[PDB]
């Protein structure tokens, strides 16, 4: 799409407030994303993949540490992502710790 | 055509695999927010910035809303 | 130094060293504390990396 | 006086603390051998002024 | 950890090649990995023991 209408949807997804409600939040999002719209690191999806390994080693959910490789193979096989490194970097940065009692649907 | 339907099939596939990756790491994203971020990655975006934005807005909707 | 386990053979007192798993946003320090105890040379044929990984699971429990 | 005494001392103290932080920054990349760092601030001072200067990506 | 250690110790004391040390050490490992709660059929017991470990720290609060 086009980024200026697209960032507004991110302000509408996270906040419960519409775009006709608040305008400071959109300006803070434009403050960060505008002028930091270029990746300041170059892509290596391997390094971030081997830290999702170490997170599932950390949780002793190491049956799912081998499930993750099938999730990582698929992403390369479709190739409809501009960067397969970027979204992994996003999901690891937004991580938490759901330790104690696994659940997976695998596909 | 045919390759105009293959690309939509592939995006429905990749969003479902990325949803599994988002839920096993216990992130705040769901199927609707994840599509916004993938569309952002099509234009090219620094994810170091995007995650700090989302880290702020979730705290600015549990302190303002 | 505080314990009396400092009179041992110097090798085994060198072989242990603390091994981090990783850093995560939010985890108590106990789960991200594990000793390394790696050993190489001709001794490495008995005790490979694969041994220490299964031992990481047992040390963890 | 103040222009022949104090102001140069204040400038010198600033610059010396600055070079101290630069050397500790260039020594933090270098780690036994970490005891050069430990000896330099034995009491522990001029290593908790700020961790690193803040920025954002 | 004592009967498995006995099982290992007698097999290493009789070991007339390196392969006996290796092939005994792996069995000594593979009984500790199963008598401790570290399989995937015993996963429910681990989760329940986590619940025990949680009510412990609840009691302090």
UniProtKB/Swiss-Prot annotation, chain A:
PTM annotation (Phosphoserine): residues: 107
| Tissue specificity annotation | Ubiquitously expressed.
Q: Where in the cell is it found?
A: Cytoplasm, Cytoskeleton, Microtubule organizing center, Centrosome
**Where does the chain cross the membrane?**
none
Q: How does it assemble?
A: Component of the gamma-tubulin ring complex (gTuRC) consisting of TUBGCP2, TUBGCP3, TUBGCP4, TUBGCP5 and TUBGCP6 and gamma-tubulin TUBG1 or TUBG2. TUBGCP2, TUBGCP3, TUBGCP4, TUBGCP5 and TUBGCP6 assemble in a 5:5:2:1:1 stoichiometry; each is associated with a gamma-tubulin, thereby arranging 14 gamma-tubulins in a helical manner. Gamma-tubulin at the first position is blocked by TUBGCP3 at the last position, allowing 13 protafilaments to grow into a microtubule.
Q: Which family does it belong to?
A: Belongs to the TUBGCP family.
Q: Describe its function.
A: Component of the gamma-tubulin ring complex (gTuRC) which mediates microtubule nucleation. The gTuRC regulates the minus-end nucleation of alpha-beta tubulin heterodimers that grow into microtubule protafilaments, a critical step in centrosome duplication and spindle formation.
Q: What is this protein called?
A: Gamma-tubulin complex component 3
Which species does this protein come from? Answer: Homo sapiens (Human)
Q: Give from-to of the shown chain within the full protein.
A: 7 to 113 of 907
From Swiss-Prot, chain B:
- Function statement: Required for the recruitment and the assembly of the gamma-tubulin ring complex (gTuRC) at the centrosome. The gTuRC regulates the minus-end nucleation of alpha-beta tubulin heterodimers that grow into microtubule protafilaments, a critical step in centrosome duplication and spindle formation.
Describe the protein's quaternary organization and the partners it interacts with: Associates with the gamma-tubulin ring complex (gTuRC) consisting of TUBGCP2, TUBGCP3, TUBGCP4, TUBGCP5 and TUBGCP6 and gamma-tubulin TUBG1 or TUBG2; within the complex, interacts with TUBGCP3 and TUBGCP6 to form a luminal bridge with actin that stabilizes the initial structure during complex assembly. Interacts with TUBG1.
The record's family statement is: Belongs to the MOZART1 family.
Any GO CC annotation of this UniProt entry: cytosol
Coarsely, its chief localization is: cytoplasm
Q: Does the keyword Thylakoid apply?
A: no
One Gene Ontology BP term is: microtubule nucleation by interphase microtubule organizing center
Q: Does the keyword Cytoplasm apply?
A: yes
Q: Which organism is it from?
A: Homo sapiens
Can you name this protein? Answer: Mitotic-spindle organizing protein 1
Keywords from the named record = Acetylation, Cytoplasm, Cytoskeleton
Q: Where is the protein found, in the record's own terms?
A: Cytoplasm, Cytoskeleton, Microtubule organizing center, Centrosome; Cytoplasm, Cytoskeleton, Spindle
Q: What is the lineage of its organism?
A: Eukaryota, Metazoa, Chordata, Craniata, Vertebrata
Curated annotation (Swiss-Prot), chain C:
The protein's location, in the record's own words, is: Cytoplasm, Cytoskeleton, Microtubule organizing center, Centrosome
Q: In which tissues is it expressed?
A: Ubiquitously expressed.
Domain of life assignment: Eukaryota
Q: How does it assemble?
A: Component of the gamma-tubulin ring complex (gTuRC) consisting of TUBGCP2, TUBGCP3, TUBGCP4, TUBGCP5 and TUBGCP6 and gamma-tubulin TUBG1 or TUBG2. TUBGCP2, TUBGCP3, TUBGCP4, TUBGCP5 and TUBGCP6 assemble in a 5:5:2:1:1 stoichiometry; each is associated with a gamma-tubulin, thereby arranging 14 gamma-tubulins in a helical manner. Gamma-tubulin at the first position is blocked by TUBGCP3 at the last position, allowing 13 protafilaments to grow into a microtubule.
What is the similarity comment for this entry?
Answer: Belongs to the TUBGCP family.
Q: What is the purpose of this protein?
A: Component of the gamma-tubulin ring complex (gTuRC) which mediates microtubule nucleation. The gTuRC regulates the minus-end nucleation of alpha-beta tubulin heterodimers that grow into microtubule protafilaments, a critical step in centrosome duplication and spindle formation.
Q: What is this protein called?
A: Gamma-tubulin complex component 3
Instruction: Look up and give the organism this protein is from.
Output: Homo sapiens (Human)
Swiss-Prot record, chain D:
Q: What is the official name of this protein in its record?
A: Gamma-tubulin complex component 2
Q: List the disulfide bonds.
A: none
Q: Which source organism?
A: Homo sapiens
Top-level taxonomic group: Eukaryota
Family indicated by similarity: Belongs to the TUBGCP family.
Q: Intact protein stretch covered?
A: 814 to 876 of 902
- Linked pathology: Cortical dysplasia, complex, with other brain malformations 15: An autosomal recessive disorder characterized by global developmental delay, variably impaired intellectual development, speech delay, facial dysmorphism, microcephaly, and varying degrees of cortical malformations including pachygyria, thin corpus callosum and subcortical band heterotopia. Most patients have generalized seizures.
Can you state the subunit structure given in the record?
Answer: Component of the gamma-tubulin ring complex (gTuRC) consisting of TUBGCP2, TUBGCP3, TUBGCP4, TUBGCP5 and TUBGCP6 and gamma-tubulin TUBG1 or TUBG2. TUBGCP2, TUBGCP3, TUBGCP4, TUBGCP5 and TUBGCP6 assemble in a 5:5:2:1:1 stoichiometry; each is associated with a gamma-tubulin, thereby arranging 14 gamma-tubulins in a helical manner. Gamma-tubulin at the first position is blocked by TUBGCP3 at the last position, allowing 13 protafilaments to grow into a microtubule.
Subcellular location per UniProt equals:
Cytoplasm, Cytoskeleton, Microtubule organizing center, Centrosome
Summary of the tissues where the protein is detected: Ubiquitously expressed.
